[PDB]
Amino acid sequence: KTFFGQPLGLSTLFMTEMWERFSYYGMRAILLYYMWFLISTGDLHITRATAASIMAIYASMVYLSGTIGGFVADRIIGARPAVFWGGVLIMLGHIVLALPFGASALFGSIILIIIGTGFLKPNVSTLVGTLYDEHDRRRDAGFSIFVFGINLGAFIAPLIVGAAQEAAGYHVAFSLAAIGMFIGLLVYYFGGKKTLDPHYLRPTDPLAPEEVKPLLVKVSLAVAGFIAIIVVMNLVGWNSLPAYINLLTIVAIAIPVFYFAWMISLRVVSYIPLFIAAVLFWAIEEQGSVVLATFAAERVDSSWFPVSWFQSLNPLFIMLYTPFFAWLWTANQPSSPTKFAVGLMFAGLSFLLMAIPGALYGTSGKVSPLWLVGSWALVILGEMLISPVGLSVTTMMSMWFLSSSVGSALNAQLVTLYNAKSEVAYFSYFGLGSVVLGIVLVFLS
Ligand SMILES: CCCCCCC/C=C/CCCCCC(=O)OC[C@@H](O)CO
Numbered sequence: 001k002t003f004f005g006q007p008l009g010l011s012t013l014f015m016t017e018m019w020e021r022f023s024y025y026g027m028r029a030i031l032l033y034y035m036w037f038l039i040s041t042g043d044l045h046i047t048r049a050t051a052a053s054i055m056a057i058y059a060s061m062v063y064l065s066g067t068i069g070g071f072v073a074d075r076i077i078g079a080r081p082a083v084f085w086g087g088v089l090i091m092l093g094h095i096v097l098a099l100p101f102g103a104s105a106l107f108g109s110i111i112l113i114i115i116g117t118g119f120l121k122p123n124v125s126t127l128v129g130t131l132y133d134e135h136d137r138r139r140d141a142g143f144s145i146f147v148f149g150i151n152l153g154a155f156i157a158p159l160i161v162g163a164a165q166e167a168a169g170y171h172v173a174f175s176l177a178a179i180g181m182f183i184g185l186l187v188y189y190f191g192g193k194k195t196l197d198p199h200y201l202r203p204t205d206p207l208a209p210e211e212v213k214p215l216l217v218k219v220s221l222a223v224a225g226f227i228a229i230i231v232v233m234n235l236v237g238w239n240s241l242p243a244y245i246n247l248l249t250i251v252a253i254a255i256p257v258f259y260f261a262w263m264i265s266l267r268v269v270s271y272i273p274l275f276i277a278a279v280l281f282w283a284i285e286e287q288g289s290v291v292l293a294t295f296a297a298e299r300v301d302s303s304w305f306p307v308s309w310f311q312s313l314n315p316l317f318i319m320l321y322t323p324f325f326a327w328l329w330t331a332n333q334p335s336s337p338t339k340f341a342v343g344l345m346f347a348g349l350s351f352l353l354m355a356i357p358g359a360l361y362g363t364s365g366k367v368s369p370l371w372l373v374g375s376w377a378l379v380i381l382g383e384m385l386i387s388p389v390g391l392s393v394t395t396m397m398s399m400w401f402l403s404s405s406v407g408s409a410l411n412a413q414l415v416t417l418y419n420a421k422s423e424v425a426y427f428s429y430f431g432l433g434s435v436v437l438g439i440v441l442v443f444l445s
């Protein structure tokens, strides 16, 4: 008796991640529209450009937090508690938004989820490997099944949450996200005790006595320096929300900039164009929940259904393409930098495609939802070529997990350029921009 030929414990982690991704992407599907709403009532004193920038940097921090959660679990708290307490903080983040508050709750919600996802996201995948011996040939299948559960949650969430927001408002919809995470915790907690190794209740590589102090010092210097920067910023008058957002953008981009300059000082050099292509691809893919969400709400005949449902197309196409590419890579298979190149080209085509309706019809009307369907089909096609390979090429493993954070940080700057007047230029310029760089990468391949 198995779960698709895998140890029964996979069923627990499958559901755990399905519900967490439900909570996360359910929130993402309506958070931007929610900020627009708070703005329209005068409760939130920012522009839509800033709100769009917030969504991008929010994403950026979540991915950044993810590069740290594995360490904290491996060295300090253990993978099993990390997942649990991460789940708790994620649940509380969605509760904060469900409470009878407005803009005052946004920061607290954002922080809780950044930290919680940081503890949960890397460590659930770790525990999946825990199910198998070193020997097990079933590993690749088990992770594929796990990924399917991730995509499932991401798929149903905007449908269910978006419908709920339409029927019962934002606060109820945010509560559904919280309940989703809660369900994830129930199944995880009770299902875990039956199936998970008690070894992972504790860290597997705990700090040795002599490691405690320098780690505390290292963490301390970072906080003091970051706090110092913020003090100076407020002294010299750089203290607006766009300013803090720029600071985090700089931070998110500096980290890979430093580790490279650190490590360089020589095939690492060859990894640079790969890393650049990854950042750019993630930038475009992550604009689906920001720029494309804006386009869906302003430029699409979506009178008969919640416009947040467009967020379901991303994981839908992942699920549709997946068994195909599963087959395709079994049946000369192109190289890895070739995949990145063609992978970035498809991202570029997805934005080039979106420039068409504005150029043909104008930007003051509404167009068919099919334009967005086509756009997402194109970008996810690019994801099938880049994501399954990116970790393999880089084998700096962290560099791979950071490419998504840098793309989002870059987006935090770029998405402020998008509006009805700049629609066609935005899509053409960046669409073509990414296509040419994918052409360059073929030359450098
Ligand atoms: C996996 C590869 C797929 C590539 C996607 C490209 C195919 C479709 C592109 C967009 C279709 C155009 C819209 C069709 C339509 O019914 O237009 C009606 C009109 O209301 C438009 O405003």
Ligand SMILES: CCCCCCC/C=C\CCCCCC(=O)OC[C@@H](O)CO
Pocket: 095, 098, 099, 100, 168, 169, 171, 172, 175, 178, 179, 182
């Ligand atoms: C152990 C805790 C787990 C449970 C998760 C927390 C969620 C439980 C109940 C959520 C109640 C929804 C909020 C109701 C509400 O504010 O109504 C909004 C009002 O504006 C109606 O339009």
Ligand SMILES: CCCCCCC/C=C\CCCCCC(=O)OC[C@@H](O)CO
Pocket: 229, 233, 237, 238, 239, 240, 242, 243, 244, 246, 247, 250, 251, 254, 255, 258
């Ligand atoms: C080890 C990697 C991290 C190192 C970070 C390097 C530099 C950190 C901070 C410096 C950036 C200055 C802040 C910029 C800023 O807030 O400008 C805002 C202003 O233009 C808007 O009103």
Ligand SMILES: CCCCCCC/C=C\CCCCCC(=O)OC[C@@H](O)CO
Pocket: 439, 442, 443, 444, 445
């Ligand atoms: C408007 C028309 C655009 C047509 C574009 C066609 C050309 C695209 C790429 C040209 C070079 C081939 C790349 C093949 C390759 O893998 O490397 C070899 C290349 O470096 C040859 O010099």
Ligand SMILES: CCCCCCC/C=C\CCCCCC(=O)OC[C@H](O)CO
Pocket: 080, 081, 082, 084, 188, 189, 190, 192, 193, 196, 201
């Ligand atoms: C009286 C109100 C407060 C009660 C709620 C607080 C939380 C209750 C129990 C905490 C349990 C800690 C879980 C840590 C953990 O590793 O869980 C993992 C599971 O064992 C499965 O892996």
Ligand SMILES: CCCCCCC/C=C\CCCCCC(=O)OC[C@H](O)CO
Pocket: 072, 076, 077, 206, 207, 208, 209, 210, 212, 215, 216, 219
């Ligand atoms: C998730 C909780 C927050 C931890 C971050 C604080 C980082 C700074 C110093 C590390 C604190 C670790 C405390 C426990 C510890 O490692 O000491 C005992 C050693 O295992 C044995 O000497």
Ligand SMILES: CCCCCCC/C=C\CCCCCC(=O)OC[C@H](O)CO
Pocket: 353, 356
């Ligand atoms: C077996 C695969 C089938 C799909 C093939 C992919 C199609 C590739 C390019 C299609 C054409 C480019 C989009 C332009 C477009 O939508 O024009 C349509 C009219 O403008 C609609 O009013």
Ligand SMILES: CCCCCCC/C=C\CCCCCC(=O)OC[C@H](O)CO
Pocket: 356, 359, 360
């Ligand atoms: C592989 C080919 C797939 C099919 C797409 C081919 C080209 C797609 C779009 C080209 C431009 C579409 C609109 C043209 C346009 O807006 O003309 C500009 C007018 O002068 C506006 O005043």
Ligand SMILES: CCCCCCC/C=C\CCCCCC(=O)OC[C@H](O)CO
Pocket: 349, 350, 352, 353, 355, 356, 358, 359, 360, 424, 425, 428
């Ligand atoms: C699978 C095919 C993918 C589709 C890509 C083909 C189309 C590429 C670019 C189309 C749009 C080009 C720019 C149009 C443009 O800016 O014209 C000016 C407008 O009239 C004013 O904004």
